[PDB]
């Protein structure tokens, strides 16, 4: 009645041995965790990274948030120090409940959150911090620079130090040379009571991993990848405004929605309270949302394993159908790795090779189709040198790399090979096929991968 908490997600407690390699571990828990979308990981008892900072010298610009179920919010992007924010956040919670903060039960804050967001008369607003690491506000994990203590040095090269995990060698997003700050760098989050993250999935359906450095807990709701489209159908019925087309990536619309509503429509949902010193991991295409119990400080980063590669291709296809902008070119990343085949991890080499083979067969079919439409002239083009906004399909907005069509009639415009009819009204013999590689260039790149993989 009123609120029925979803069942608890899986909780893992790896030994020091299991813990040592994060990628091996994540692959091991995958058959369990991917059925629930999110999972929690408790590090071995003596893994404690040192947290140290001056609460007076760390500044950030707060974001303001209204708390209404089904109301549209925009996804990403006055002044507080960490101390002045903390004083504001503690007083807020203390005055809301007329209690000391540590006596307010987590079960009660959860019940109250879902009451207040549904009640139109209540108009509670809260503030929070969200930003990538910078000079004015940096990682909560140790990084190189300032002389470090021996304990800080222990954690400098940990796999679970979230600065490192993007650039390790069983991850596939490391060798991307393209500028993608939002996606390879950690984000820092300063929470207060009821500050909330709306329902979403990660860019390119990647994994995410979140560490709560300190403070009061963070409450999570998660949905497994296989149920993503069920959730979206429910969302579309109850709030169609969120689904209208949008001019860019800085304009994505998201919302708060009671998990009991999803469960009523037969969408599986799980929950957890993440406490200080614990990790939460989200899997590819797993919807998630939540809210903070009180003043706290968290750090999170996207990442991509060899398991993810085929889904990454399927995601870019889904973006095309939806006319959604890409953060990077998937084919470009694949060819960049093929070109470094001799220094690749051998399991990586093997998995990249399979995706490359599919890429090449799809590209063969597409070029044959546009040839039969009467496009004859062609010229090689180094797509990776063009700014992203100069190589998007006019129609579906996909980031071009393997090929595109141009016409002298519309200087600078491109369509991908799926949308040859959408460029202009000139006859196809006036068009030109721009391509990065010939078929004959591509098969040897693939062979280097096979040899490295053996």
Ligand X SMILES: O=C(O)c1cc2sccc2s1
Q: Which residues here bind ligand X, judged by CB under 6 A?
A: 30, 34, 128, 130, 189, 191, 195, 197, 225, 283-284, 292, 298, 307-308, 310-311, 360, 363-364, 367, 437-439, 442
Instruction: Kindly state the smallest distance separating residue 288's Cβ from Mn ion, in Å.
Output: 6
CA angle (39 as vertex; 348, 227 as ends), nearest 5: 85
**Partner from Zn ion, Cl ion, ligand X, none binding residue 122, C-beta < 5-8 Å depending on class:** Cl ion
**Partner from Mn ion, Cl ion, ligand X, none binding residue 68, C-beta < 5-8 Å depending on class:** Cl ion
Q: How many residues bind Mn ion (CB under 5 A)?
A: 1
Quick count: other Cβ atoms within 10 Å of Cβ 412?
8
What are the backbone dihedrals phi and psi of residue 122, each rounded to the nearest 5 degrees, phi first? -65, 135
Contact indicator for 162, 133 with CB cutoff of 8 Å: no
Contact indicator for 102, 94 with CB cutoff of 8 Å: no
**Partner from ligand X, Mn ion, Zn ion, none binding residue 447, C-beta < 5-8 Å depending on class:** none
Q: Is 397 labelled a binding residue?
A: no
Which residue number, 256 or 404, has a Cβ lying nearer to Zn ion?
Answer: 404
Q: Is 208 labelled a binding residue?
A: yes
Which residue number, 119 or 339, has a Cβ lying nearer to Cl ion?
Answer: 119
d(CA 286, CA 288): 6
d(CA 72, CA 84): 29
Q: Is 418 labelled a binding residue?
A: no
> What H or E segment, with its residue span, contains residue 65?
strand 63-66
Which residue number, 68 or 261, has a Cβ lying nearer to Cl ion?
Answer: 68
Q: Is 216 labelled a binding residue?
A: no
Q: How many residues bind Zn ion (CB under 5 A)?
A: 10
d(CA 309, CA 291): 31
The 117-156 site mask, x for binding Cl ion (CB under 5 A), equals -----x----------------------------------
Near Mn ion in 219-278, by CB under 5 A:
none
Which residue number, 122 or 229, has a Cβ lying nearer to Cl ion?
Answer: 122
Instruction: Kindly state the smallest distance separating residue 290's Cβ from ligand X, in Å.
Output: 7
**Partner from Mn ion, Cl ion, ligand X, none binding residue 61, C-beta < 5-8 Å depending on class:** none
Contact indicator for 175, 278 with CB cutoff of 8 Å: no
Q: Where are the beta strands (DSSP E) in 304-398?
A: 378-380
**Partner from Cl ion, Zn ion, ligand X, none binding residue 426, C-beta < 5-8 Å depending on class:** Zn ion
β-pair type (187-191, 296-303): antiparallel
d(CA 446, CA 337): 10
Q: Is 202 labelled a binding residue?
A: yes
Look up tokens 């990647």; give the residue: 206
Angle between helices 439-453 and 346-371 (to 10 degrees): 160
Instruction: Report which residue's Cβ sits closest to Mn ion.
Output: 208
Q: Is 264 left (phi over 0), alpha (psi -120 to 50) or beta?
A: alpha
- Residue 426 binds Zn ion, judged by CB under 5 A: yes
- Residue 432 binds Zn ion, judged by CB under 5 A: no
d(CA 126, CA 80): 14
Instruction: Report which residue's Cβ sits closest to Zn ion.
Output: 409
- Residue 241 binds Cl ion, judged by CB under 5 A: no
What are the backbone dihedrals phi and psi of residue 390, each rounded to the nearest 5 degrees, phi first? -100, 0
d(CA 166, CA 162): 7
**Partner from Zn ion, ligand X, Mn ion, none binding residue 409, C-beta < 5-8 Å depending on class:** Zn ion
Contact indicator for 326, 205 with CB cutoff of 8 Å: no
Select the residue interacting with Zn ion from 89, 281, 407, 433 (CB under 5 A): 407
Q: Is 245 labelled a binding residue?
A: no
- Residue 73 binds Cl ion, judged by CB under 5 A: no
d(CA 55, CA 71): 34
Which residue number, 117 or 298, has a Cβ lying nearer to Mn ion?
Answer: 298
CA angle (228 as vertex; 222, 232 as ends), nearest 5: 105
Segment near Cl ion (CB under 5 A); pick from 60-68, 238-246, 306-314, 357-365: 60-68
Q: Where are the beta strands (DSSP E) in 119-262?
A: 125-132, 187-191, 196-200, 207-215, 218-222, 253-254
Contact indicator for 171, 305 with CB cutoff of 8 Å: yes
- Residue 66 binds Cl ion, judged by CB under 5 A: no
- Residue 396 binds Zn ion, judged by CB under 5 A: yes
Which residues lie near Cl ion (CB under 5 A)? 68, 122
Which residues define the annotated binding site?
A: 128, 200, 202, 208, 210, 218, 288
Which residues lie near Mn ion (CB under 5 A)? 208
Which residues define the annotated binding site for Fe cation?
A: 200, 202, 288
Which residues lie near Zn ion (CB under 5 A)? 393, 395-396, 407, 409, 416, 418-419, 424, 426
Which residues define the annotated binding site for 2-oxoglutarate?
A: 128, 208, 210, 218
């Amino acid at each position: 009645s009123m609120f029925l908490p979803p069942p608890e997600c899986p909780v893992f407690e790896p030994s020091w041995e299991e813990f040592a390699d994060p990628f091996a571990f994540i692959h091991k828990i995958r058959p369990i965790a991917e059925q629930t979308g999110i999972c929690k990981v408790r590090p071995p008892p003596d893994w404690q990274p040192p947290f140290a900072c001056d609460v007076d010298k760390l500044h950030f610009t707060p974001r303001i948030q209204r708390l209404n179920e089904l109301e549209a919010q925009t996804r990403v992007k006055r002044d507080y120090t960490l101390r002045t924010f903390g004083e504001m956040a503690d007083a807020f919670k203390s005055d809301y409940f007329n209690m000391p903060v540590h006596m307010v039960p987590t079960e009660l804050v959860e019940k109250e959150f879902w009451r207040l967001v549904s009640t139109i008369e209540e108009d509670v607003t809260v503030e929070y911090g969200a930003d990538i690491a910078s000079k004015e506000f940096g990682s909560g994990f140790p990084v190189r620079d300032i002389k470090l203590s021996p304990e800080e040095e222990e954690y400098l090269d940990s796999g679970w130090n979230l600065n490192n995990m993007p650039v390790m060698e069983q991850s596939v997003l490391a060798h991307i040379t393209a500028d993608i700050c939002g996606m390879k760098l950690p984000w820092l989050y300063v929470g207060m009571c009821f500050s909330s993250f709306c329902w979403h999935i990660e860019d390119h359906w990647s994994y995410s991993i979140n560490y709560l450095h300190w403070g009061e807990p963070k409450t999570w709701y998660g949905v497994p990848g296989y149920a993503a489209e069920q959730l979206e159908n429910v969302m579309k019925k109850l709030a169609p405004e969120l689904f209208v087309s949008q001019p860019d990536l800085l304009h994505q619309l998201v919302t708060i929605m009671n998990p009991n509503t999803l469960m009523t429509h037969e969408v599986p949902v799980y929950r957890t309270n993440q406490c200080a010193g614990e990790f939460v991991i989200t899997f590819p295409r797993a919807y998630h949302s939540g809210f903070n119990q009180g003043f706290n400080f968290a750090e999170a980063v996207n990442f991509c394993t060899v398991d993810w590669l085929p889904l990454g291709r399927q995601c870019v296809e889904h973006y095309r159908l939806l006319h959604r902008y890409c953060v990077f070119s998937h084919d470009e990343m694949i060819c960049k790795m093929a070109s470094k085949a001799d220094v690749l991890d051998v399991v990586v080499a093997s998995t990249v090779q399979k995706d490359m083979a599919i890429m090449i067969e799809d590209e063969k079919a597409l070029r044959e189709t546009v040839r039969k439409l009467g496009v004859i002239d062609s010229e090689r083009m180094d797509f990776e040198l063009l700014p992203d906004d100069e190589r998007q399909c006019v129609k579906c907005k996909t980031t071009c790399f393997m090929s595109a069509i141009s016409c002298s009639c519309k200087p600078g415009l491109l369509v991908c090979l799926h949308h040859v009819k959408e460029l202009c009204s000139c006859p196809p013999y006036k068009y030109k096929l721009r391509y990065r590689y010939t078929l004959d260039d591509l098969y040897p790149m693939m062979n280097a991968l096979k040899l490295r993989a053996e």
